[PDB]
Scaffold this active site. Sequence first.
Site, short mmCIF file in Angstrom:
data_model
loop_
_atom_site.label_atom_id
_atom_site.label_comp_id
_atom_site.label_asym_id
_atom_site.label_seq_id
_atom_site.Cartn_x
_atom_site.Cartn_y
_atom_site.Cartn_z
N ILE A 71 0.86 -1.16 0.00
CA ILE A 71 0.00 0.00 0.00
C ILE A 71 0.91 1.22 0.00
CG2 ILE A 71 -1.95 1.15 1.07
CD1 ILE A 71 -2.64 -1.45 2.44
N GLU A 160 -2.00 -9.10 2.75
CA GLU A 160 -1.51 -10.35 3.35
C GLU A 160 -2.34 -11.56 2.93
OE1 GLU A 160 1.30 -10.21 4.12
OE2 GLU A 160 1.84 -8.59 5.57
N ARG A 163 -1.64 -12.47 -0.59
CA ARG A 163 -0.36 -13.18 -0.58
C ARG A 163 -0.48 -14.63 -0.13
NH1 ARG A 163 1.71 -7.83 1.82
NH2 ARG A 163 3.43 -7.23 0.43
O1 LIG Z 1 5.18 -3.80 5.60
C1 LIG Z 1 4.36 -3.99 4.68
C2 LIG Z 1 4.26 -5.24 4.11
C3 LIG Z 1 3.34 -5.45 3.10
N1 LIG Z 1 2.55 -4.44 2.68
C4 LIG Z 1 2.66 -3.21 3.24
O2 LIG Z 1 1.93 -2.26 2.84
N2 LIG Z 1 3.56 -2.99 4.22
#
Ligand SMILES: O=c1cc[nH]c(=O)[nH]1
Length: 246
Positions: A71, A160, A163
Amino acid sequence: DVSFRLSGADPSSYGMFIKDLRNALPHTEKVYNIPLLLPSVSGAGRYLLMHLFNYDGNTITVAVDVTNVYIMGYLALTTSYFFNEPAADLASQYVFRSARRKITLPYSGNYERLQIAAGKPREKIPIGLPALDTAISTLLHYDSTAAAGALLVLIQTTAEAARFKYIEQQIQERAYRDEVPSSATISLENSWSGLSKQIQLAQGNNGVFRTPTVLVDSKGNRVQITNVTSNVVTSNIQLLLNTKNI
Ligand SMILES: O=c1cc[nH]c(=O)[nH]1
Ligand SMILES: *[C@@H]1O[C@H](CO)[C@@H](O)[C@H](O)[C@H]1NC(C)=O
């Protein structure tokens, strides 16, 4: 663009939003059958907009760097906000140009800096779909201290989960009850760089990790990931941060 509406959301529409998101992220090649994120993407094509709508139908738009799923910044009505970091500032000259005012947040977008601003590590911050709804609301009106905590919940409910299947799944059971993230859920948040690296070095190492990755499992038990035949690689992980970025 990809979207997700918290009104009438079920663990299904969330799965679908997470699905969309993954497929919004380009890649020419898979590594052990796992999308390999690009080294770099020139210009506005570098960033992905997520239209999110809280339960009462108010929206924000989150920009995401597609080479790394980070982000960079977001927009609340007519105010844009980008983190205190060069990629974010970079990101700022392509997106939300039409925002009346742009606000640089007082922190860079990493967990350490986010957790300090918020005043608690993410192990004590409930997440889920309600905590996502909150987040959306909190960021609607600027409060840097609050917006820290709310970004820790947005990153996690979005980046996350996209991912990692496991984490996506952890968010679908938190469809109606927020809950602090499992120890493993954190492990995997923190190991993404590592796994993206080792999975790629296994390409000319016979699927063996040059350097084993230490994880925590579903049970709260610490374990080691030595090879591509581990469930984490075969099942869990959905995306790889290019080694051209590590
Ligand atoms: O630290 C992080 C890890 C993944 N995505 C993010 O925006 N910040
Ligand atoms: C591969 O990992 C599996 C599961 O973790 C384990 O049983 C096995 O000993 C490992 N084999 C190799 C070749 O690394």
